Design a protein around this ligand. Structure first.
Ligand SMILES: [Mg+2]
Ligand SMILES: [Mg+2]
Ligand SMILES: [Mg+2]
Ligand SMILES: [Mg+2]
Lengths: 135, 131
RNA sequence: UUAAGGAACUCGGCAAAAUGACCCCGUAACUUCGGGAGAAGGGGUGCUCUUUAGGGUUAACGCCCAGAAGAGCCGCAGUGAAUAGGCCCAAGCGACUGUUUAUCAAAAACACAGGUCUCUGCUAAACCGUAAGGUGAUGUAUAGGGGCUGACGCCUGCCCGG
RNA sequence: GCCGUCGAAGGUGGGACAAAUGAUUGGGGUGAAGUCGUAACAAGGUAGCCGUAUCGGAAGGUGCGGCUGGAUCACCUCCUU
RNA sequence: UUAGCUAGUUGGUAAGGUAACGGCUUACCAAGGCAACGAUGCAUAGCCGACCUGAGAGGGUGAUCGGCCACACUGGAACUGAGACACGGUCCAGACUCCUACGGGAGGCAGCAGUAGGGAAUCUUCCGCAAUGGGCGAAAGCCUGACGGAGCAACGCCGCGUGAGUGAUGAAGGUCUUCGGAUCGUAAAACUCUGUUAUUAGGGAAGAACAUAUGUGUAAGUAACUGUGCACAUCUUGACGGUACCUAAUCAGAAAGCCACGGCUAACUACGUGCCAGCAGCCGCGGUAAUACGUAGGUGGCAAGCGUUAUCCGGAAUUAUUGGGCGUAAAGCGCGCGUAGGCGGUUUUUUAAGUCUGAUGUGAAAGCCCACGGCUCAACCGUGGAGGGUCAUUGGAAACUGGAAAACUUGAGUGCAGAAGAGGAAAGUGGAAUUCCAUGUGUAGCGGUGAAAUGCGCAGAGAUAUGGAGGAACACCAGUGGCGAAGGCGACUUUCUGGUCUGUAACUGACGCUGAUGUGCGAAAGCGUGGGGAUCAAACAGGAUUAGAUACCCUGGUAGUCCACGCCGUAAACGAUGAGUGCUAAGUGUUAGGGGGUUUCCCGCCCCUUAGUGCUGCAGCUAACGCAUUAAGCACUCCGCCUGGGGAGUA
């Protein structure tokens, strides 16, 4: 607005937030801070494999799993793909990405880097779902 | 109370263009007549005629129009206004409207068009665009 | 008086011991802003020598009064003996401080300021008395008597058949 | 060698700050076609709505004032060719 | 949603201390100091040159390279010394690890490597002192995990290629086919060249090498190059590395993939699938014929790289100085008095802080950008340029802002003569009406509803008449009329008393506008204390309707409405439009005034001019409705406010 009314206040903006709100890290041990990490991926131990539904108007049994991470928090993840090589207690890596089936998940694991084994029922997007080249 | 005379002059001017009657009245001042001579030298004005009585004014102007009655400018405004005064160098100055209009400006040596201010390599305190 | 331990005794820390004076630092919650609060906790204190502030009293002398600074001495211990507060947190009951069962109960009871209802138009009502008489009352409904409740502030619901 | 000042660490204590935590508990968001009712949307079937007070299982009702963002019907009066 | 902090604090005196000044530190006198221009306290953090992005203003970060700083297990102190309060030094205390004959002793990789540990994730326990720079020395020379330089990582940037020309048959073969044919397709096969690169063998062992010491002559100085201190000449030095590079020979044989194909987006067909498995960046696909799922074929993009995830900027004009808005879409406080601050009418003279201009210095180097040259080109390296400061110093200009001085009236205020008004506070007076009671009159219903009931009534109601009390409100007038800053103010009269409008113009001569923080007034309800209590009427009771109705309807009915002193301190406090100034078409009524003509007299009619007040309307604006001299138009100043909705005006 008027100029001195902009002088005597710093003209503040509309600061964003995080979209993958993993504490980043946080410093589970030692010397707790916790910030900052900004890691692109994290390992974590999964203590159950399960499945739910979305809200309307979509309907499908989406398969998910709740997981304790390195930083010792508690979050949820939908695993993608046909078949899931996992169970209780199993380690697994994590990315981010939200799906609109519901809240109660805004992440999803990656297939093939660790215990979650690549599914070779694909040939087309083999670069994902953990697949390696067939011949 | 009038915070600013530029507003008085340029606003009676625009309001007079939108209606298109030739003549117009206003209390005088030193800068007003100086720049009015410049506008007469632009071609944006026909003529002026000073007149005097208790105490200032009235700087009387007669405006100008085409035979098809098109307004010779399209636009107008100041720049250097109260609160936020502004200045510009001799090199830094703008060439309004790539060359058509003008940018009135004050100098250490008088009030002039912008062109004479870049040729002379003397800047100063800008007043107003017009175009 | 009693080493070691320190409420294990115990109905219960009953009693006993510990604290205790002066000055200085400092002093939370909560609060009806007054307090709580000496909160708590913690420190110093002896005699000599030196130097200095001083105030009252006087012509002045000196007579009194009670501080500071240093420097030293001693002993385990310097308000050396005696007299002189134990504290913190939390809860119910009661607001107080006060009185009470003289010779077994001192309290959560009684009263208390406040609140409320009802009575009473003046030799007023109530009352003591047989009656005069007198209290109430040198009073005159912002006054007097009776009942119930008990500071504060939030509140004080339904039923008029008996 | 002894003594004195200064001196970190440790010890005693009372408070400030912050985070995790706890029986139960209040409110909120969301989900199965849940049960009860139907306040609002037109005059929403008692016009609504803002403020305040109260009562209610609850939306909400009532009460005092205020606005039309109001309608069946009509403005005192003024404006319009 | 951090507003008071500080006592050696702040100032002085003296001394001491330090390389030096200094509350740096002691003893005394003193109570100052800092803060809305944000002290303090709180969490976060090494900074800068620069890097990324963006057209640009700007936004984000502080890797490598270079400059400054602090640190060396944590913490403290001091010696040596020019310099340290010491990174591979001590002394002390502490934690930790370890040796011990148990008395006691030892140590410190955030140096290079390397190990474990955490983590999504970051390498060889390399060769060498040839070069450059170090340290000692007279020099040779020695030490140099600095450094030269090899090795691992597609981590990134740059570059070459995985062959090229001729080759149709539209071969085989795949897929599809409306079953003719189309498609992969000069693609293959085949023919003809090449061998960048690779396989082999030679040369090169290219440069990076300049050197110091070693002999010759030459000048300064010495009595004496006898010896000394200096420019030419030869001798002699490669870790990398037998490298790079070069030269000849050999074979198209070793050397290609990833994602996506509904749109946004360049890129379509068949099968399976059937609201299932699944995709998803958005919008959304999927329930038997999916171009969106999975499979195939083909195509597009892209390339030894490609996709996803996390982060930053852009697009974002979605903090809007360049570059926004507030009638209704989020958004103008309820309104006022006024401080600090911000802005400021005209003319003249001056000043030179701001401003403009010129110069001197500086703004390290590297980097960015431009020109050039070399590495085969590029990357890269160098050179040189321009470039960059809110920068210091200094000479000039005066229009503008600013400071100082002199003058002016048009803004504002004071006057003088006037006009009006429900403007406010207190007291006083009066009529109707409701009600309560009393009395006279007189009987059987009143009152209420859509229909009823509950209630009042033979104790004679209601109705009717008289007079009495008592509280509250004031019919007509009243009108888009007035007043006031808003909330608000309507019986009348007195006392006190605030502002406004016109005309006037002598009068002072810019005294002004806005207004954070503060201060005060503020509907109705609400609260305290005390008085009053006629109606009206939350809560409540009863009746009725109703499936039910603690709701509408009806009969009663307390607080309360009322007064006074206090308190809260809000609203659809609305025109949902901040204040102030100035300019721009008319018409038409209205309210208080003013000037003039006509009239015998205007009091009547008309024309004009001020101030508020309403309606229709252009220019113009606005998304539209609409506003239109009482602007939502044209602009300036000042203030307040908004940045998706719920969560929530909650905690
Ligand atoms: Mg003990
Ligand atoms: Mg005990
Ligand atoms: Mg009593
Ligand atoms: Mg007017």
């Amino acid at each position: 607005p008027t100029i001195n009314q902009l002088v005597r206040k710093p003209r503040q903006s509309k600061i964003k937030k995080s979209d993958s709100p993993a504490l980043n890290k946080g410093f589970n041990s030692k010397k707790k801070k916790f910030t900052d990490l900004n890691s692109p991926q994290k390992r974590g131990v999964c203590t159950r494999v399960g499945t739910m539904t979305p809200r309307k108007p979509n309907s499908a049994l989406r398969k998910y799993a709740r997981v304790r991470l390195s930083n010792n928090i508690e979050i949820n993840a939908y695993i993608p793909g046909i078949g899931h090589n996992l169970q209780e207690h199993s380690v697994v890596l994590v990315r981010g990405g939200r799906v609109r089936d519901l809240p109660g998940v805004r992440y999803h694991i990656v297939r093939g880097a660790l215990d979650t084994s690549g599914v070779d029922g694909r040939r087309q997007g083999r670069s994902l779902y953990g697949t390696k080249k067939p011949k | 109370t009038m915070t600013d005379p530029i507003a008085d002059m340029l606003t009676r001017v625009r309001n007079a263009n939108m209606v298109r009657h030739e003549k117009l009245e206003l209390p005088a001042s030193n800068i007003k007549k100086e720049i009015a001579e410049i506008l007469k030298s632009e071609g944006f004005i026909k003529n002026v005629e000073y007149v005097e009585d208790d105490k200032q004014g009235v700087l009387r102007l007669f405006l100008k129009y085409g035979q098809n009655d098109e307004r010779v400018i399209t636009g107008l405004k100041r720049i250097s206004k109260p609160g936020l005064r502004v200045y510009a160098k001799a090199s830094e100055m703008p060439k309004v409207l790539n060359g058509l209009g003008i940018a009135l400006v004050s100098t250490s040596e008088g009030v002039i068009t912008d062109k004479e201010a870049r040729k002379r390599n003397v800047g100063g305190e800008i007043i107003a665009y017009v175009w």
